[PDB]
Design a protein around this ligand. Structure first.
Ligand SMILES: COc1cccc(-c2cc(-c3ccc(C(=O)O)cc3)c(C#N)c(=O)[nH]2)c1
Length: 184
């Protein structure tokens, strides 16, 4: 089983990744995890991070520019992901394709049924061949307007079943229970 943990920064996705890892392994499962963007390895991921800190002239001013950058990062790891799914019972991804839909829709003031979110699917899953996750787990916990709104879009994706089955959880979800829901 392949699982994206999704949510906003500061939301504490990494902690939930570690939590589920323990639980899955407690349940007798081999787990691999991997996190995006892959700063330090993907030149794309790096140029995106940099473009957001002022560098690279007018790059960050284009929503589809950034999304294309974060997409190309993930696409670069497509063979590793595919390869972890052949070697482990579970592969947990901290941020994945639905990150691009939430952050783009939010910046473009669009909703889950809109163009950005549709575009992310064509590019990342269809065109670039990234595998659809079996589950996407939104960690939804209490630029701030944009961060609120991106939070809200994520949740629109959960509600629409965008990309596949989802689950929405908060800060104190029991890991054993969530693990047993997410597993066969
Ligand atoms: C800035 O404008 C745009 C425009 C379009 C897409 C995106 C966008 C953002 C991220 C992202 C990465 C790290 C963190 C963090 O840890 O704060 C937060 C968000 C991902 C990912 N992964 C992605 O795919 N797309 C951003």
């Amino acid at each position: 089983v392949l699982i994206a943990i999704e949510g906003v920064d500061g939301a504490g996705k990494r902690t939930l990744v570690e939590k589920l890892s323990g639980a899955f392994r407690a349940a007798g499962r081999s787990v691999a995890t991997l996190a995006f963007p892959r700063y330090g390895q993907s030149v794309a991921a790096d140029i995106a991070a940099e473009a957001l800190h002022g560098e690279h002239g007018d790059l960050a001013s284009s929503v589809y520019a950034m999304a294309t950058l974060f997409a190309l990062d993930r696409a670069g790891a497509v063979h590793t992901i595919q390869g972890l799914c052949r070697g482990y019972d579970v592969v947990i991804l901290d941020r994945y394709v639905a990150s691009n839909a939430a952050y783009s829709a939010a910046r473009l003031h669009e909703n889950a049924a809109g163009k950005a979110a549709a575009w992310v699917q064509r590019i990342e899953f269809a065109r670039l061949g990234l595998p659809k996750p079996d589950w996407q787990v939104l960690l939804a916990v209490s630029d701030a307007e944009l961060q609120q709104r991106t939070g809200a879009v994520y949740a629109e994706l959960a509600a629409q079943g965008w990309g596949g089955r989802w689950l929405v959880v908060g800060a104190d979800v029991d890991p054993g229970r969530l693990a047993a829901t997410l597993a066969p």
